Amino acid sequence: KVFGRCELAAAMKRHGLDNYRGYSLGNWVCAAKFESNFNTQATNRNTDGSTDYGLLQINSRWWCNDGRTPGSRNLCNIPCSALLSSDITATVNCAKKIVSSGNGMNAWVAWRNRCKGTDVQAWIRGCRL
C-alpha cells in the first residue's frame, strides 16, 4: 500500500513511534519517504545479496528472514514479507529494535543522508495529529 504523508504520520504515532528513543515523528516520516517513497511493498536488493524491505527498508542480513540471505540473524523474528503488509505493525516493532541497537536512526542511511539535521518537522506539518 502507498501511504499518504499524514496518513502515515498518524499510523506511526498510534504505533508509538513519536519520540521513540528521542526521535520526533517527523524523523520517522522523513525516513519512510526516502527509504521507500511511502510504499510498504518496496524491496531493494543489495550487492552482499541481502535485500531491504518495506517502508523502512529493513535488512534481511540482520533483521528478518527471507530464506535467501545466508547467515542472516533474523533479529526481529519475522519473515521479511511481513514488512510489506499494509498493516505497519511488524515494521514498527522491528524499527523499534533497530533504533535501539546502538546507532539510533543512523542505521537508516537515507535518514542519515537526507533527514538528519534538516527541519524534519515539516514532514508532519498540516497533519491532523
- Helix residue percentage: 25-40%
Total DSSP helices: 4
CATH class identity: Mainly Alpha
Order of helices and strands: HHEEEHH
CATH topology: Lysozyme
Name the shape in a single word: globular
Q: What fraction strand?
A: 5-15%
Tell me the number of strands: 3
Biggest β-sheet: strands ordered side by side in the sheet: 1-2-3
Rg for CA atoms: 14 Å
Tell me the distance between the termini: 21 Å
Q: Could you give a short account of the major beta sheet? A: 3 strands, antiparallel
Number of domains: 1
Protein structure class: mainly alpha
**Which CATH architecture would you pick?**
Orthogonal Bundle
PDB class: hydrolase(o-glycosyl)
Keywords: hydrolase(O-glycosyl)
Assembly: monomeric
Entry title: thermal stability determinants of chicken EGG-white lysozyme core mutants: hydrophobicity, packing volume and conserved buried water molecules
Note down, in words, how this protein is organized.
- By secondary structure, the chain is mainly alpha-helical.
- The chain has one domain: Lysozyme (Orthogonal Bundle).
- 30% of the residues lie in helices and 6% in strands.
- It has a three-stranded antiparallel sheet with strand order 1-2-3.
- A hairpin with a 4-residue loop joins strand 2 and strand 3.
- Helix 1 (5-14) packs across helix 2.
- The longest helix is centred in the first third of the chain and has 12 residues, at 25-36.
- The chain is globular.
- The two termini are 21 Å apart.
